[model samples]
Structures are given as C-alpha cells and as structure tokens.
Target: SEDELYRQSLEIISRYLREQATGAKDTKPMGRSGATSRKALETLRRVGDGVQRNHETAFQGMLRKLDIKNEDDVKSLSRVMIHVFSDGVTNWGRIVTLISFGAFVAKHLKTINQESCIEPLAESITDVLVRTKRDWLVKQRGWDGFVEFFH
Candidate 1:
C-alpha cells in the first residue's frame, strides 16, 4: 500500500503537470474525476484539489522570496527543496507537503512552457526524500503512512 500510494501519488501529480502542459489555465479537474482512492485523493487535497490556488499563492511567495521563479534554473529549485527537506524530516506530513509543493512548481513550470524542468524537479525531490527520510519512510511503510497519518 505504501508503494502503491507513492506511485499513485506521483502519477497523479504527473497528470496535473501534463494538464497544465496542455494549456489548462486552472487546476480544477483532479478531484471530480475520482480516479484514485478517496483516502489518497483526500490526502492530496490537504495541499491540492480545491485549495490549490491558495497553496500556489503561498508557495509562490515563498519561492519568490527565495528568488526562485518559474523562469529560474532547476538548480535553484533543488536548492530550495534541499533547504525544505533539510529543515526537518520529523514526520510524514512534511514529506507530503514537500511533494505537493513540488507538484505546484511542476504545474507552474509547465504553465510557463518550461516543461524540460520537470525531470530535475522530480529528481530533486527524490534526492531529498532518500537523503532525509528513506529509513523513516520505510519504517512507516512509504506513502501508506502518508494516508494513514492523516486518517
């Protein structure tokens, strides 16, 4: 269930990225489809679904304050992520927030037509997760813990 949720999570985010890539202006399609488990989608909605605009705005200011823009290089992106993951890996919630935050960046990148940047964004998240929370995640049974945590 952990790996399933993890894989499903990424694929769901990838779908969101591609939706933005298709010139979709708003991220209003994810929830209504009910494609993933209700519990999984509920976890995602803690940072996404209807609340995406607000989350984007908040994270946009965060990245902006850090001088990280959609037009900026991927290195800067990872730098911010490294800082985020480095701050604390005390709980699964942080990892979920980080992952969702990356999805926001991915959506913005695609919106700006900088689709090439998505790979490195994903890679950066991977590096941080492994470096900061691999053992923690394994102990929690990967993203199965994420869903169970919010429950």
Candidate 2:
C-alpha cells in the first residue's frame, strides 16, 4: 500500500545517503539543487524538498529549516512530503499517500498545537527521513521490507 512504498523509497534514499557519507563510494548522486542535473533537481524540488542551498556547503542544503505556523503550515508540511516522496517520471504513488493520509492525520493530531513545536518536529522528522545521520543505515529501521506494494 501507500505505507510500504513511502517507507521503501525513504529506505533507499537513506542507503544512498550512507554511501555518500562513508566514502564507501563518491557518486554525484542526485537531489542537490540549481547546480545539479535536471533529473535530480526535478526530484529534489519536486514539491519543495528544500528551499535554498546553503552556500557554505557543496550540496547539504536541499532540505532547509521550514516555517511551521498554525492554521496553514499544514500545507507547508504537505508540500515537501509531496515532492521528496514522489518521482515525476518514476514512481507515482507517494503523492497520493499524502492526499489520502492528510485528512486523517490533520484531524487526528489536533493536540499538537504549538507552532514552535511543529518546526522542530518537522525538522527532526525530515532529519531522520532524509539526510542527517550518525551511522546512516545503522540508524535506519534496517527494513528492506519496502518491497513493491501497489496502492
């Protein structure tokens, strides 16, 4: 289902990041913005993966800090998830997962009302999902269980 595809794609991206970190291999992996290839940028900025590339680093700013505000940041949350979790020419299901899950999640998590908390929560979650890692794969769910699942 949606959950499987979502999780699986993340897992692969996780491993890809690991390879970059370890010097196990140095590949010009996609996802960096502006200066990167068209295909990768297409994926990186699909919805709004990251706002700006931090000039200090080579390609570490794809996912930047976001502003999370009540009554509307929900869409901010929705936008990045929509893109990073999706592929314009490849997989087509993750985008739908957000739409399907949004209503339920939005309604179900009302008690998380602090806007300040939301940014940290989002940053941490994105940190876990995409880039930041101490041991990369070692830190992931280690689930190759992201086998293909149609939704």
Candidate 3:
C-alpha cells in the first residue's frame, strides 16, 4: 500500500537524519561562532530552507512512485502512517537498526564497492522482500507487532 511505503521511506530517512545529527555532534558545528547573532540566525534559516526544499523534492519523487495525485493526499496519508509505525519506536533504535542492517549487508555483498555503499544497502533491503520468507513473518506479526518486537 502507499501508506506502508511512505511510512517505510519516512522511517528510513528519519533514521538517516538522526544518524547524521549524532555523528555531527562529535565534529565542529556548522555556522559561525563569533559572528553577530542575527548573522547566525540568517545562516541557519538558509540552511533550513535548503533542507525543506530537498525534502519536498524527495517527497515528490516518492509520491510519483506511489501514483499519488496530490500533495495534500500524501501529507494526510503520511501523518497516519507515521503515527502507526513510529508511535513507539525510539529514534536511537531506528538509527541503530538501520546502521547495523546496512553494515551487515555491506559485509556480505560483493556488488558493493567503496563508492557505491548506498546501492548495496538499497539492494539488501529490496532483496529481503524479494528473496526472504517474509510473508510468514508478516503474517505472524502485523506491522505494528513486528515493529514493536524489533523495538
């Protein structure tokens, strides 16, 4: 379903965001320290706007795949889907799971090269659905139950 796909995509992207944020904490923060406060705010605003634009582009791409006709429908569906999948899962847990899964697949996959890390992760995720006995798993535990178990 479109809702399921959107929720999954959001979960993946949110995991990526949290991982990036946590990793950035150890590095020097972006933006100026000694500059005037207004200058800093302006810089942050520009960055935020860029992020929002990128998010819109990505969201539109997903909507195209789902054959969604409008942004409003996508937004409405996403809210419900997020509440369903991410209601109880912590951001840390999601990040850890995404990283661990990516690492595991990266280790075993021969097609993954230094420059193509993302391809392997994407392939590994798709492979699980394509080749694994996932129907039984899904049947055993519905979406909420399955996600909760992992959490």
Candidate 4:
C-alpha cells in the first residue's frame, strides 16, 4: 500500500515537472523546486522510512484538492507557480497560461459549488512559492545576500 502511494506521488510530481520543462528556461521559474524534486521524492519514498513515507502522503494530501487529470485543474496549479515565480510580472506565455488557468479554475469552482476552494489553494501554493524562493535565494547566494535582496 505504501509503495503504491509512493509510486503515485512520483507519477504526479513527474507529470507536473514534465509539463514545466516545456515552458521558459530563461524565465526563472519559481521554486526551481530544485533539481531532484522528482529524484528526492523517488528516493525518499523508496527508502521507506516512516518520515519519508509521510512526506509522500502529505504531498498527495495537497494534490487531493484538484483533479490533476483535468487539463484545467493541472493548468491552474501551473499558473500560480508561474506567476509567483515571475513576481506577478510576466511575459506573454506566462500571461497566457495564467489567464487561461484562471478561467478554468473559476468554472471548476462554480461547477462544484465551492467557490471558496481557490482561496485556500492559492494561499497554500503562494506560501510554498514564497518559501521555495526564500530557500533558493539562500542557497544560490548566502544569508547576507538573502537579507540584502529584501532591502
């Protein structure tokens, strides 16, 4: 059961990452998520450690909010990721994805009679984007530069 769940985690993140690689490389994608988002998930899950297994479980929990198989659902998550990475400033492709994704998510919420869903999802995603960016800044530069960037 745990392995099955682990495999599914890999599949979900793999699909998401694969789709991202199709987009702008020069665009400074948010979270880089860093190399090995997939590999780490794969390894951690495979290790079968209690803490690691729970990581997979938690990832899947976040995924439960949307229907990943639906193009619109997937794109909605993609949009937030792209937009946050761009700091709300965007290029043509990014704008296109953001707008299209918004339209789809709006319709989806209406269909489900849960217009409130997007708020929570966006908050979680935005927090992750911020946290991920902070992590990247610290890693790419250093503590001093990280502080400098803020000021």
Candidate 5:
C-alpha cells in the first residue's frame, strides 16, 4: 500500500514537472544559445522543486488534521479529494480542488487555510507577474524608448 501510494504521488509529480517543462519550451524564445537553455532548465528545476515542496507540506498538514497515521492515509485522502473535486467541468473542478485542498491543509496543519495558505500562494503568484512585467518594461527602455525604436 505504501509503495502504491508513493508511486502515485511520484507519478503526479513527474507529470507536473513534465507539463511545466513543455510550457517553458513552448513559450521561451526560439534560436537561443546553449547558455539560455541552461538558464531556463535551471530556473524550471528550481520552480519545480518549490512546487513539489509546497504540495508535500500542504498534504502532510492535511493528514495531521485528519489525525491520520502514515503517508498512505494522506495519499488515499488526496486521491479521493482529487477525484471528487475534479469531475468533468473545468471551472467547477478548479474551485473544488482549491477548496478541498485548503480545507485538508487547514485541518492538519496549525497555520494553513484561506488566510495563511491560499492568500500567500495568490500573493506570490501576483508578485512574480509584477516582477516579470517590470523586467519587460526595463528591457524595452520604458514606453518612450519603445516608441522611438518602433518608429
């Protein structure tokens, strides 16, 4: 049972990483040098590690809430939650997954819930977007620089 559960988690994590790598490959500029490839791979690895760590921490916290013993129990609960929350509808499934996972984490972990866990996740995502936008602006040398270059 432990082996099966661990395998499932590993499968999910592997899929996640692969999907992220695919997206990075598709969106990254083409005709890049080997250095760019190296940098992109390193960045993807770091981000993937962050995501994996966060998910494991949240899942463990949820197990504590249910007062369950062992990773098997947590994995079982997570599978059930994923299945129930995932139904066929995309938007519905997304909302259900967020709510179910948040509840699970809150019940197990001492300081996780809408306020502490979910909000922080949202904030971090937003912060990254803002930083990326600023970086783009800087590379463009502000709006006036962009206009002059284009004209």
Candidate 6:
C-alpha cells in the first residue's frame, strides 16, 4: 500500500535529515521500529556514492539563487528541489536526488543556526515525492524495489 510505503519512506528520510542536521559522528544507520528493511538501508547507502558530487553542484546553485538567510526562502528550499525533479525526467535517481539535496540543505541550515527548519523541510520534501510520484513509487514497491532495480 502507498500509505505503508509513504510512512516508511518518510520515516527513513526523517531519520536521515536528523542525522544530517546534527552532523552526527556515529555514521551508522539507526534502528527504526519495524519500518525500513535492511535491504533499503544498504541500497540507500549505495545510492549515495554517485549523488555526492551532484549534491555539491546543487547546493552551490541553490545558494546562488535563494537567499538562505531569509527564513521564508529557507522554507522554500523544497520548492527548489521539486523544480529539480520536475525539470528533469522523473526516476528513482531524481527522487533520491531530491532527498539527498534536502539533506545537504539541512546541513547548511544547521550551520546557519536554522536547525529548526530541518523537520519541516524534510516533510515538504517527502510530501512532494510521495504526492507526485505515487504510482511510480508504488509500482517500484517503495524502497524495496529500489534494492532490485539498483542491484
């Protein structure tokens, strides 16, 4: 079901955002209460390999366009990410890209003392993905299918 996938994905992403915002040094996947599977975590980590470079480029470009100093503009970072997804052909990579970029922004926000924005920003990102990519995500069996597809 989409609801199960949605909630699970959101939970995974929220955990990720929290870690990014805090720059936690532990550097290990956290346990969730029967939420995400081990396969999902492994694939998620593998996806990180190629996307890190894009995060650098995207973060710089985002800074150039948006005044992150403004609270409202900071909140609209998800809008910028949504546009990235919309402008490109939609795919799992793009969805992961969106969330990874959000994580980058989350870290930046933490650096600038706007840590409060992380959760709302995460929710906005997740909402956009689940809302806009419902059929595709469900067909992929949520993150579970990511394991197979990216295999």
**TM-scores, one per candidate:** 0.65, 0.23, 0.29, 0.26, 0.24, 0.79
Taking the tens digit of each residue's C-alpha lDDT, what string does model 1 give over 37-148?
4455456655454345657678777656755445456677677677757865467656666766766667667666788877667666666666666667678766556667
lDDT of 1 at 14: 50
After superposing candidate 1 on the true structure, give the runs of residues whose Cα lies further than 4 Å from its correct spot: 1-42, 45-47, 66-72
Best by TM-score: 6
Give the top-scoring candidate (lDDT).
Answer: 6
Whole-model lDDT per candidate? 0.60, 0.33, 0.35, 0.38, 0.37, 0.70
Per-residue C-alpha lDDT of model 3 across residues 55-76, encoded as one tens digit per residue: 5555445434544333333334
TM-score-based ranking: 6, 1, 3, 4, 5, 2
Least well predicted 10-residue stretch by lDDT in candidate 3: 25-34
**Alpha-carbon deviation at 74 in model 1, angstroms:** 1.4
Cα distance off (Å), candidate 3, residue 128: 2.4
lDDT of 4 by residue, 1-151 (tens): 3333223323323333323323222233323333434443333223323332335454345446656444456447756565555574423233223323333443355456554444444343434334444444335342233223323
Candidate 6 local lDDT, 1-151, one digit each (tens): 4366667677777766776678563345444435345566556556753575646886678666776764687667767666767563767877777777777777778888988877788788888888778888887777777767787
Show how many residue pairs clash in every candidate, following the order shown.
0, 0, 0, 0, 2, 0
Better of 1 and 4 by TM-score: 1
**Candidate 2 global TM-score:** 0.23
Q: Is candidate 3 or candidate 6 better by lDDT?
A: 6
- Give the runs in model 4 whose Cα sits over 4 Å from its true position: 1-103, 135-151
TM-score of 4: 0.26
